[PDB]
Amino acid sequence: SSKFSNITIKNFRNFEKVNINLDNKNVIFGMNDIGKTNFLYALRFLLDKEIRKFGFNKSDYHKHDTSKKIEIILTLDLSNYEKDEDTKKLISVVKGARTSANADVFYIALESKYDDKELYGNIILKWGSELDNLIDIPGRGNINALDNVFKVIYINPLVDLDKLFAQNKKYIDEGILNNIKSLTDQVNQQIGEKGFQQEITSEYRSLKKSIELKSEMAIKGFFSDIIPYIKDGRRKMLSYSIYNYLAKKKYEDKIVIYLIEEPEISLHRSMQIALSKQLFEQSTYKYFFLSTHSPELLYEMDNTRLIRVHSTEKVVCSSHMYNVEEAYGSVKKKLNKALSSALFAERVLLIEGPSEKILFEKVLDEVEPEYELNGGFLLEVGGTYFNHYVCTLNDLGITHIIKTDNDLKSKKGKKGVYELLGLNRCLNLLGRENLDEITIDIPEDIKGKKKKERLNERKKEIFKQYKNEVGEFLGERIYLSEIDLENDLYSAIGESMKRIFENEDPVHYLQKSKLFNMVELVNNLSTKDCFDVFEHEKFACLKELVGS
Amino acid sequence: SSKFSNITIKNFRNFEKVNINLDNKNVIFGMNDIGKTNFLYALRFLLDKEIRKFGFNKSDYHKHDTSKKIEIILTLDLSNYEKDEDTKKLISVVKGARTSANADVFYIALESKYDDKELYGNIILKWGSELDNLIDIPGRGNINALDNVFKVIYINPLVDLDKLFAQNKKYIDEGILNNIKSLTDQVNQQIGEKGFQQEITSEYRSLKKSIELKSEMAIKGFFSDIIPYIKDGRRKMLSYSIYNYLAKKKYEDKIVIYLIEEPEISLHRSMQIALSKQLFEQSTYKYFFLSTHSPELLYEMDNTRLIRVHSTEKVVCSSHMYNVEEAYGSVKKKLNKALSSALFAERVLLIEGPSEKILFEKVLDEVEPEYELNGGFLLEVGGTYFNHYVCTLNDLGITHIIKTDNDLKSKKGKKGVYELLGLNRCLNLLGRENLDEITIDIPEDIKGKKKKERLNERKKEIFKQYKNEVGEFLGERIYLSEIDLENDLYSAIGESMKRIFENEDPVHYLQKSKLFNMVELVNNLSTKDCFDVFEHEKFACLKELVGS
Amino acid sequence: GRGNINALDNVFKVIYINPLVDLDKLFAQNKKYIDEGILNNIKSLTDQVNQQIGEKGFQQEITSEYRSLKKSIELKSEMAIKGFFSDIIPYIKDGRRKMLSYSIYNYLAKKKYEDKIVI
């Protein structure tokens, strides 16, 4: 359902052989800053006439090897031709280069072979329906048929608004203009109305065989300079405001593709969210490619493809089609802001709530305070299932770790029925179906602390029944507690928790106020306590997060 | 206890009259990008010889008025002279410009008066112990005594490592060097060992009345070019790695001041945290001024002064000495990451946990989804008191709003005693002392849901007793619920909550699993429900957050 | 000397004539230092430009786009804000304009630097 299928880059700079799936809206990010920039340049060379005329240098070839040929192919999908207007744009120019047998697909390729004597390898653009017999894109002079289809707008991080406005002023009443024109000449008559015009001529005439020297603008009219005025960081957003209005009117007849590199540069965090809303929520930017290091620039992300360039020197690329389902729509904004910062990390530990974050932040601080520097990240997920977070992180090649409590949820409208919520979420990551809800018989005289302890006994009983299902969880880096985190914490530092709280049952007291008591616990936690919790088998997720 | 007291900027560019307190480590941020840049330039003009020799242009004067004089004064504190080594650095150069009566203070001023005929206003640097009779800083030629005290290192956002390395190579064995030197000459003898050297001379000699042409490096030795090699974004951190080692050895005899502008540019989020740890935790950067738009660059902030430039055109500056107390040290990293993003907002709503964030994000989405674009922010605080967050936001001129539940906490080691935790935190913001803990008599047969309902009756009773104390909370934008959020939510949409949950007591069912049930609630919440919750008097904090 | 100037800078003013020079750029340096009832009519007429320029579809649509993006966008025209004197570049009635730059230097330096020795 997207015109842009995938792009292939062969032997171009650090790209040995890289295949990346695509969509209308694409966002690229990762550690390799060189790979992200070369990715945008590889798209410009294929589609931007100004950057393509310069040809390939020796450095652009992969590993500076001129024998290997540079090849950049863009695969397109024309299946939605019946209801896509921009698809008909491409068809009208391609004409007979398509075949009816493969009418759904169309290829746009860039081939380059290097000449030693000419010290210069030219760029030959081919297209066609079949990848085997691509034909040269027809052209006459400095323009070809491809330049009539696609117009590439590259938004530099740093831009002067007055300079770009001078480019758009020309194309963007008459009886009124005539009065302004005659009045413009009225300026020059009053300016001359005098001692300098006559003395510079007497000096010029003796020097060289009328020197009036009027004033600019009045010669060419008021339209020559019409720079804007509002009523550094603020004017950057007005340049985007010009781009939206300009490109639609100027390039309505062709497909416009935006290449936005690092737009968060010299931009406030609040404006980054404003730009993110305009990129995804608004239909103003139909097709763009975005390179960003800013998590706040993805707060409003939806219906986009996320491309992650790996930190390795091989320049491996992992792409994910990020789409928020309608069921998650009521918590979409909360979910995106938490996941946006996790895309840039290397290992993400899925925790439930803030009480786990308060504990883990203190424990990690004593054991390994540089865990975020090396790519670790604590992502808290509350109320929702793990599938949306795991699918996005898995496709992007990000190591995901899950630590959740074994919980039971009472079904509404019926008493005595409890859903196996803790197991179902871990089973959902493995693709298995939700387990049947169970009914446990608790007497009416058993309430409060006595009631909770009996429910814990069912959790331990349920945990033992699915002993093999837990075995599959550990292979998938899923860590399901027997009862909950507080009981696993008691197993690691029971002597410390009893001394810290002086209460004979520290687990019961910790769960009274989970946030406050966890803060009270971490304040009195010893350094050996943090190492004991870290080294304990029940907390293997902390060892997997640091990556030892 | 800090050498840098405050700085005064008068009639310099957009700074009409601005007074900013300072410390050794300073971070500046805000909407006004022009004010932050002019703030760093105002410091360079006072202390950087290279930027000071160019003098003041007409544009540098405030509102382009040359009548008003530009004045930049830096107030210093020399009280810690007995134990501060860098203080003795300044004393050794100032010599007799200090008086013993005001020995604790020293002024460094920049005065500029404009000449119409000379079209140029020079920079006159004065210093002295008394602000009334400042004396010209002694100098001879292009250097003065102040250039011997302070060395300003300005770190540009974009820097080439090889170029800065060429500046530091000179100042950073012999029998080994002698073998490398003779071997270097061995290159040239083997290079000549020939057809080009004789033919270009035959052409040159006929053209003009020996043309051997050897090879660079071999003439000046191997030390001329020694560029580094490791075994774009990665090399930026190595440039900082050079700066730490270079500046300490090169400028050990003088006070080095770093001016770092927008270092998050072209830097990964993980490296920003690495740089933040080096700025605050490490003692490598004793004195610096930091301009940043990145919240991740303040994850490790501590013992620094936060300067916030207001969004207004008057360029108002609010400064806060941010310091984390020892009591908050066990949750310092968790607290900083939440507060770092709140410094850049304009209105911050302090909520307790994520269940409040899940609800507020959905409600705000329907009512005002652009609330973060206009400066709103939801900051969740769990387990800790509000004083640390409110003091930082209040000093920076950021509107702070607090919404918390009226809670009771059981004291450890004793039953029947409950602390008025909900009221104490709101009283702590007003400066009042903690209230005396109360004891409520609950029978042993009353447990579970019946026990919670009796405790709610005490909360309503406690709420009515302190009816006037709640009145002072509303003036301070403190919103204390009578019982909790769930009961206030029932008051706003009771009909909707009963229909959504089908349970006769939706408040009791919502509190069973606060996270999951809140997600279940917001999914079925109507648009009119969000407007009813927003318009209700119990949720006036949402109206104060958007700023209507 | 005091600051960036010394007594020698008050005696001698050095004019360095580069082989390649743009006349319009050097003229912008000398325009400031080189009647009133006439200037007042030119000034009011300069404001008469801006009133007739706005007299309209772009000023309202860019604001609707800006206001939704960020919490009036009229955008007039340069020169009319600072007056006619901001840009007054010359016009005669590459090699020829080089001699006119010397023609400016002779007249400029004598009036501007009459009080000091010009080299």
Whole-angstrom distance, CA of residue B536 vs CA of residue B528: 12
Give the distance from residue A64's alpha carbon to the nearest chain B alpha carbon, in angstroms.
18
Whole-angstrom distance, CA of residue B262 vs CA of residue B251: 24
Tell me which residue in B264, B330, B370 faces A523 most closely, judged by beta carbons: B330
Tell whether A273 is within 8 A of chain B (Cβ). yes
Give the distance from residue C97's alpha carbon to the nearest chain A alpha carbon, in angstroms.
11
Tell whether A40 is within 8 A of chain B (Cβ). no
Q: Which tokens go with A514?
A: 């989970």
Whole-angstrom distance, CA of residue B521 vs CA of residue B531: 15
Residues of C in contact with A230 (CB under 8 A): 72-73, 75
Give the distance from residue B211's alpha carbon to the nearest chain C alpha carbon, in angstroms.
32
Pairing relationship of beta strands A150-155 and A255-261 according to DSSP bridges: parallel
Angle in degrees, 0-180, between the axes of helices A195-207 and C95-112, rounded to the nearest 10: 120
Whole-angstrom distance, CA of residue B514 vs CA of residue B401: 23
Identify the CA nearest to A261 among candidates A536, A433, A41, A486: A41
Which resolution in angstroms does this entry have? Answer: 3.0
Identify the CA nearest to B262 among candidates B110, B406, B395, B157: B157
Given an 8 Å threshold on Cβ–Cβ distance, is A204 in contact with C58?
no
Give the distance from residue A412's alpha carbon to the nearest chain B alpha carbon, in angstroms.
7
Whole-angstrom distance, CA of residue A172 vs CA of residue A228: 14
Tell whether A238 is within 8 A of chain B (Cβ). no
Given an 8 Å threshold on Cβ–Cβ distance, is C5 in contact with B125?
no
Tell whether A327 is within 8 A of chain C (Cβ). no
Whole-angstrom distance, CA of residue B509 vs CA of residue B157: 54
Instruction: Say if residues A183 and C49 touch (Cβ distance below 8 Å).
Output: yes
Residue A504, helix vs strand vs coil: coil
> A415 among the known binding-site residues?
no
C-alpha dist (Å) from residue B219 to A287, A534, B422: 55, 60, 79
Interface test with A, best of B36, B335, B358 (most A CBs within 10 A): B358
> B176 among the known binding-site residues?
no
Instruction: Say if residues A282 and B381 touch (Cβ distance below 8 Å).
Output: no
Whole-angstrom distance, CA of residue A406 vs CA of residue A464: 12
> A453 among the known binding-site residues?
no
Compute how many other C-beta atoms are within 10 angstroms of the C-beta atom of residue B353: 22
C-alpha dist (Å) from residue A399 to A341, A384, A528: 14, 20, 28
Breaks in chain C after (C-N > 2.5 angstroms): 34, 55, 71, 93
Tell whether A36 is within 8 A of chain B (Cβ). no
Q: How far is CA A437 from the centre of its chain?
A: 39
Instruction: Say if residues C62 and A189 touch (Cβ distance below 8 Å).
Output: no
Determine if residue B290 is left, alpha or beta; phi over 0 gives left, psi from -120 to 50 gives alpha, anything else beta.
beta
Residue-wise DSSP of A303-342: SEEEEEE-SSTT--EEEEEE---STTGGGHHHHHHHHHTT
Identify the CA nearest to B386 among candidates B345, B348, B328, B426: B426
Instruction: Say if residues A320 and A23 touch (Cβ distance below 8 Å).
Output: no
Q: Which tokens go with A483?
A: 């009862």
Residues of B in contact with C81 (CB under 8 A): none
Tell whether B124 is within 8 A of chain C (Cβ). yes
Compute how many other C-beta atoms are within 10 angstroms of the C-beta atom of residue A414: 9
Residues of A in contact with B291 (CB under 8 A): none
Tell whether B135 is within 8 A of chain C (Cβ). no
Residues of B in contact with C2 (CB under 8 A): 122, 124, 136
- Chains with 3+ CB–CB pairs under 8 A to B are A, C
> A436 among the known binding-site residues?
yes
Long-range CB contact pairs, B176-185, < 8 A, 24+: B180/B222, B181/B221, B184/B217, B184/B218, B184/B221, B184/B222, B185/B218
Q: Which of residues 100-119 of B touch C (CB under 8 A)?
A: 117, 119
Tell whether C21 is within 8 A of chain A (Cβ). no
Pairing relationship of beta strands A399-404 and A409-410 according to DSSP bridges: unpaired
Tell me which residue in A295, A334, A341 faces B361 most closely, judged by beta carbons: A334
Q: How far is CA A481 from the centre of its chain?
A: 33
Give the distance from residue B519's alpha carbon to the nearest chain A alpha carbon, in angstroms.
6
Tell me which residue in B232, B412, B447 faces A448 most closely, judged by beta carbons: B447
Given an 8 Å threshold on Cβ–Cβ distance, is C70 in contact with B373?
yes
Instruction: Say if residues B3 and B104 touch (Cβ distance below 8 Å).
Output: no
Residues of A in contact with B268 (CB under 8 A): 31, 33, 293, 344
10 Å CB burial of residue A161 (0-12, 13-18, 19+) is middle
CB pairs under 8 A between A and C: 120
> B453 among the known binding-site residues?
no
| Amino acid in the structure at residue A27 | V
Q: Which tokens go with B175?
A: 């029998």
- Chains with 3+ CB–CB pairs under 8 A to A are B, C
Interface test with C, best of B370, B371, B546, B548 (most C CBs within 10 A): B370
Interface test with A, best of B41, B270, B368 (most A CBs within 10 A): B270
- Residue pointed to by tokens 């927008």: B262
Pairing relationship of beta strands B288-291 and B255-261 according to DSSP bridges: parallel
Q: Which tokens go with C60?
A: 């309202």
Residue A356, helix vs strand vs coil: helix
Instruction: Say if residues C66 and A271 touch (Cβ distance below 8 Å).
Output: no
CA-nearest residue to A371 within chain B is B270
Given an 8 Å threshold on Cβ–Cβ distance, is B53 in contact with C4?
yes
Give the distance from residue A192's alpha carbon to the nearest chain C alpha carbon, in angstroms.
10
CA-nearest residue to A200 within chain C is C103
Whole-angstrom distance, CA of residue B327 vs CA of residue B383: 13
Given an 8 Å threshold on Cβ–Cβ distance, is A226 in contact with C75?
yes
Tell me which residue in C4, C33, C71 faces B374 most closely, judged by beta carbons: C71
Q: Which tokens go with C14?
A: 């050095």
Residues in chain C: 119
CA-nearest residue to A178 within chain C is C52
> A36 among the known binding-site residues?
yes
10 Å CB burial of residue B330 (0-12, 13-18, 19+) is buried
Tell whether C83 is within 8 A of chain A (Cβ). no
Whole-angstrom distance, CA of residue A30 vs CA of residue A39: 12
- Which residues does residue A407 pair with via DSSP β-bridges, in sequence order? none
Question: Which residues are CB-contacts of B435 (< 8 A; sequence separation ≥ 6)?
Answer: B420, B423, B424, B427
Whole-angstrom distance, CA of residue B401 vs CA of residue B350: 6
Whole-angstrom distance, CA of residue A323 vs CA of residue A303: 5
CA-nearest residue to C62 within chain A is A241
Whole-angstrom distance, CA of residue A458 vs CA of residue A387: 26
Torsion angles phi and psi, residue C73, rounded to 5: -120, 80
Torsion angles phi and psi, residue B123, rounded to 5: -105, 115
Angle in degrees, 0-180, between the axes of helices B467-475 and B449-465, rounded to the nearest 10: 80
Give the distance from residue C26's alpha carbon to the nearest chain B alpha carbon, in angstroms.
14
Whole-angstrom distance, CA of residue A64 vs CA of residue A68: 9
Tell whether B51 is within 8 A of chain C (Cβ). no
Tell whether A37 is within 8 A of chain B (Cβ). yes
Residues of C in contact with A273 (CB under 8 A): none
Instruction: Say if residues A311 and A354 touch (Cβ distance below 8 Å).
Output: no
Given an 8 Å threshold on Cβ–Cβ distance, is C4 in contact with B136?
no
Residues C109, C111, C112, CA angle at the centre, nearest 5°?
Answer: 60
Angle in degrees, 0-180, between the axes of helices B527-535 and B354-367, rounded to the nearest 10: 100
